[PDB]
Ligand binder design. Structure first.
Ligand SMILES: O[C@H]1[C@H](O)[C@H](O)[C@H](O)[C@@H](O)[C@H]1O
Length: 296
């Protein structure tokens, strides 16, 4: 008993997908720079703000991947940053919002990308990777198994995507070489391959063209269960209302939403977008979620 109807519930949309499907096969929405939603100062906004609603809102609109950027403080906690900007959000804060969401919707999983976003503060006693793994990761809410992670094992857990070096604890997707401002393909673990389009800081026209190109490769490779396709629709700021990430997102999100509607693909990858909201139609995350219809 599973139906495409259940894909319309953005809060439980992973429920009808068979537990045996690998997460990499599933088309999943994500948020880029997920924790920038408390910024108010206007200069901070045009340069660094990428979301306007809190974590629970993002999850309730179907996002399951979260781009968590951390900094180690002098009291040995990890807080959220966007470049050099403090975000007034802590790492525990996000995990607790994830915990609450997973308790309310135990059919779902949360994929958390963690990256070290800025140099450690001098007063800290340990390294970023060690602090994160000893004080946050050993928590049982994080799934500790590896391989080509299946949804069934991830339900009710947080699945870590390591974008930091130094890991000593198994679990999640291993760190891998992530060249700056490129589209690239490498290995995740033995037997799993990954393709990432992260051309931030590129002309608008090259950005849209790279989103579509990499989605095309996902589309035409829909039944390769081992290959991760990660597609950042976000674009870095130019410093003004004419090129902030808000301006760009107000055009790219519906542009890419139409592209999916138009192509009715069986797979579109892990689409990480700025400003998930209800302002621009068609809704990108909605079209990404519906692209899983063929899995039911
Ligand atoms: O400058 C950052 C950084 O280089 C990250 O690696 C990338 O993922 C983008 O978010 C970009 O904004």
């Amino acid at each position: 008993t599973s139906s495409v109807n259940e894909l319309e519930n953005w809060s439980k949309w992973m429920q009808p997908i068979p537990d045996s499907i690998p997460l990499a096969r599933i088309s999943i929405p994500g948020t880029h720079d997920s924790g920038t939603f408390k910024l108010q100062n206007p200069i901070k906004q045009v340069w660094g703000m990428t979301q306007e609603y809190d974590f629970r809102y993002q999850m309730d609109h179907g996002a399951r991947i979260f781009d968590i950027r951390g900094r180690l403080t002098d009291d040995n906690t990890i807080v959220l940053h966007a470049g050099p900007l403090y975000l007034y959000v802590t790492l525990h804060e996000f995990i607790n919002e994830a915990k609450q969401f997973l308790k309310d919707n135990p059919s779902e999983t949360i994929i958390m990308s963690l990256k070290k976003e800025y140099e450690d503060m001098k007063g800290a006693e340990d390294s970023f990777s060690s602090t994160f793994e000893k004080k946050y990761f050993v928590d049982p809410i994080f799934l500790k198994t590896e391989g080509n992670i299946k949804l069934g094992d991830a339900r009710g857990k947080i699945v870590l995507l390591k974008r930091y070096s130094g890991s000593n604890e198994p679990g999640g997707y291993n760190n891998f070489y992530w060249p700056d401002n490129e589209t690239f393909t490498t290995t995740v673990n033995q037997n799993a391959n990954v393709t990432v389009q992260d051309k931030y800081k590129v002309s608008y026209d090259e950005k849209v063209k790279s989103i579509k190109d990499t989605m095309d490769e996902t589309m035409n490779n829909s039944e390769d269960l081992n290959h991760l396709y990660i597609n950042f629709t976000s674009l870095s700021s130019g410093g003004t209302a004419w090129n902030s990430p808000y301006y760009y997102a107000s055009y790219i999100n519906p542009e890419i939403a139409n592209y999916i509607k138009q192509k009715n693909p069986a797979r579109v990858g892990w689409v990480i977008q700025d400003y998930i909201n209800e302002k621009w139609s068609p809704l990108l995350y909605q079209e990404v979620i519906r692209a899983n219809k063929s899995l039911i």
